[PDB]
Write a protein that binds this ligand. Structure first.
Ligand code: HEM
Ligand code: HEM
Ligand code: A1A0D
Ligand code: A1A0D
Ligand code: H4B
Ligand code: H4B
Ligand code: ZN
Lengths: 411, 419
């Protein structure tokens, strides 16, 4: 009835009761832990009823109206819609609550101290890819806010029969293209080579550079997706320079200011919002460690280390570690110099511990995925490394979903 | 059913069937994951104190079955006699005694099964010192000294475990009260600060309370506190010539030597329990060699350990007023360069986290290839610095509890009734 988590650095112990409210699977079993597995159909009428009730109950409990006339009538109204239309429609208040709580419940998100400050753009009246483009452009402009970034989500119409899904085919709203060259090398972001190819096949004329912002590939109502160029004045980018290394700007590095995940599914009360792009601001390591230094990504450790004149003939010189730090210093300095919101992994992990402890106080727990919360460099010098965490799946939730090109029926 | 793990760098997919042999709960469920809990489970294979026959024999049979299976017997003459022998021993002493071969097999397989250990590519190259004839803390000291000398080997370190008499009723436990054979003292200062290793403040106070005269310095090698057959523990000073230490200097920063840092070369875990076929070896000090990050990241830079980041950073003349300058990250790298440069210059075995994690990936592939799996705890395997530029960060792992195993146990001073 109670689970305890300890911080081995501070000795603080928190008591988790919230996990009793989880209902969906983590992927582990009693005899094997799948904590590091990355990824461990429409609901029928009878399936949807109890999911809707649980969510409406939770909503009315949250606003201290549980058992109220409004709670009871809403429940009856929801059951009526399910009974008649096999689905139902969230009120705006419920939509905002659900979206904020899916963020609040994202066990892999270190930025959740911000969860209650989320701008929710209801796009459930959207019917076409042009409409989605308009909503997404407004999302980008609002979220970017001339560098003073604001978290935001735009929610497109829910799934109906599974054959009319709204999807943003992009994994993120703003990403750079990748082009495989005849000689085996890759220009730009190798993570996006397949998506870049889909875009070109759909008629995108690529600049064939290292930092081409990809076009939006937007699917409405299960139709074939359509290409749209985000207006370049809406795509805020930061050239990456270094406060001490004059030569760093000569690497030609830049990144975009707005991280905007667009390939996940938002599940609220059994309803599935298959297009729900959301955005916050970057933690610097996402760019400096993963985007720039993953071997499968821009992979710049060698080039930076060369320019640092590091001894690269043996690993134990820690040349990779040395270059990695300087790169991440560069990322933070550049965003800060251009007054583009960014958070370093130390600030972000400290805030998440504060958030986590507050969540245990007021909510009874905070589901947290250590594998994802600990930054990908300098792990043990951030406080989350020493923080025991319990992982469990609460709903509303953000879910992975198959890439749309693996399932789309081309018209 | 049958589980796959993917490496997201290489796209290599491995298929795990070994997990079907797991015995103990992980702590996780279908609904909650406890993979970052230090001690998620208290599920043990044998109950409280001296087990009844229907409790110990099934575990014994299982281990003996496993051992005779390993050597292409099972059902052979010697196996069936061994079951009868173990059966008679439990009938007449409420326990049984491992053969030398079984002890060695058991110790190597506890190491092979240690999901949290990144060094297991070496698992079958393990020197086993049978100390089950030991009877006194003096004898334990003699065995541990021999272990330390053998394992240190003038810097060419060698993996070793020394196995003292198994638990009998729980009142006669052999214990090394030290957490590791070689650790530095920690002193609580009058002004509230801490001198030495703050992790060892309590154990240091116990030693001082037991007559240890501390030199009260930053790197005081602690005495051994040895408990034999349940008796009160006894202090022993490890002969310093057996304690190989490495002065930490930096290949570039000439001022780094002035920090006065050293570390010992031999990491030797002494507070764990070795469990083989229901038998519990409560004193089983084992040692290998260091991954540089254990010293340079955790020992030196944990806030509640030596916590040297600020002083190194000051010497480096870094911007320390804001986290976003990454001054901690900058010093952290130089410290770990220094640690590796120092050990290597002194020809003391050490492995950097890049080479270690690379070898562990290879070990995983080997284990899946011949064994059908390898239990691995990502949370512990990924190094505490530069995680994602190491291959294990990108390697999905499956964690499960195979026996024989190394287990945690209570610190004996919470258990011990003195005399
Ligand atoms: C406001 C500042 C935010 C920061 C600093 C932040 C930080 C992060 C980071 C560093 C990750 C890991 C990303 C990766 O490794 O690929 C992450 C994951 C995630 N974030 Fe946040 N985030 C923020 C806002 C948001 C918002 C506004 C939402 C939703 C409305 C959100 C939902 C998620 C989810 C669902 C994941 C996990 C994705 C997955 O499961 O694979 N985050 N966040
Ligand atoms: C030979 C070189 C070895 C290396 C480089 C190595 C490396 C490591 C490292 C880095 C850890 C994590 C330590 C920590 O963060 O506290 C660890 C844990 C562990 N090692 Fe190894 N190890 C080696 C040898 C051995 C041997 C010889 C044994 C036993 C015979 C062993 C058994 C274990 C166990 C049981 C753990 C987990 C401890 C726990 O759960 O608290 N290791 N190892
Ligand atoms: C809102 C937000 C803020 C922030 N700082 N990061 C992210 C963020 C999240 C992901 C995870 N996504 C799930 C997937 F596997 F599909 C990839 C990937 C990124 F690249 C990101 F930038 C998101
Ligand atoms: C044989 C060996 C080689 C090596 N490289 N490291 C270790 C090693 C393991 C631990 C785990 N300890 C048990 C605990 F949970 F208490 C913390 C702690 C250390 F300090 C170590 F050095 C052991
Ligand atoms: C195999 C492992 O689960 C995978 O590499 C994870 C590790 N932790 C991560 N943590 C974050 N934040 N993002 C990631 O992509 C990953 N990848
Ligand atoms: C809370 C968390 O499990 C704890 O800090 C762990 C994290 N991973 C670790 N990994 C290793 N190798 N050693 C450790 O002591 C720890 N500590
Ligand atoms: Zn788990």
């Amino acid at each position: 009835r109670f689970l305890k988590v300890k911080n081995w650095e501070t000795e603080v112990v928190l008591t988790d009761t919230l996990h009793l409210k989880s209902t969906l699977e983590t992927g582990c079993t009693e005899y094997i832990c799948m904590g590091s597995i990355m990824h461990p159909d429409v609901a029928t009428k009878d399936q949807l009823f109890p999911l809707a009730k649980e969510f409406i109950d939770q909503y009315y409990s949250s606003i201290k109206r549980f058992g109220s006339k409004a709670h009871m009538e809403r429940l009856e109204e929801v059951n009526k819609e399910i009974d008649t239309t096999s689905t139902y429609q969230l009120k705006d208040t419920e939509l905002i609550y659900g979206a904020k709580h899916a963020w609040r419940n994202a066990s892999r998100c270190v930025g959740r101290i911000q969860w209650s400050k989320l701008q929710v753009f209801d796009a459930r009246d959207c019917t076409t890819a042009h409409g989605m483009f308009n909503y997404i452009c407004n999302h980008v402009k609002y979220a970017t806010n001339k560098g003073n970034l604001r978290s935001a989500i735009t929610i497109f119409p829910q799934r109906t029969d599974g054959k009319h899904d709204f999807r943003v085919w992009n994994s993120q709203l703003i990403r750079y293209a990748g082009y495989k060259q005849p000689d085996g090398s890759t220009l730009g972001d190798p993570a996006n080579v397949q998506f870049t190819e889909i875009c070109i096949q759909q008629g995108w004329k690529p600049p064939r550079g290292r930092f081409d912002v990809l076009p939006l590939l937007l699917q409405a109502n299960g139709n074939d997706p359509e290409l749209f160029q985000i207006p370049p004045e809406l795509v805020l980018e930061v050239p990456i320079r270094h406060p001490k290394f004059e030569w760093f700007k000569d690497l030609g590095l830049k990144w975009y200011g707005l991280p905007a995940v667009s390939n996940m599914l938002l599940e609220i009360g059994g309803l599935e919002f298959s297009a729900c792009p959301f955005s916050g601001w970057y933690m610097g390591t996402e760019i400096g460690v993963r985007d720039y230094c993953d071997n499968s990504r821009y992979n710049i450790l060698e080039e930076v280390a060369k320019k640092m004149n590091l001894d690269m003939r043996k690993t134990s010189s820690l040349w990779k570690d040395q270059a990695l730090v300087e790169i991440n210093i560069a990322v933070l300095y550049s965003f800060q110099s251009d007054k583009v919101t960014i958070v370093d992994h130390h600030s972000a992990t400290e805030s998440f511990i504060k958030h986590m402890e507050n969540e245990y106080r007021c909510r009874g727990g905070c589901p947290a995925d250590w594998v994802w919360i600990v930054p990908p460099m300098s792990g043990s010098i951030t406080p989350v490394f020493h923080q025991e965490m319990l992982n469990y799946r609460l709903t509303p939730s953000f879910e992975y979903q198959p890439d749309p090109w693996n399932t789309h029926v081309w018209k």
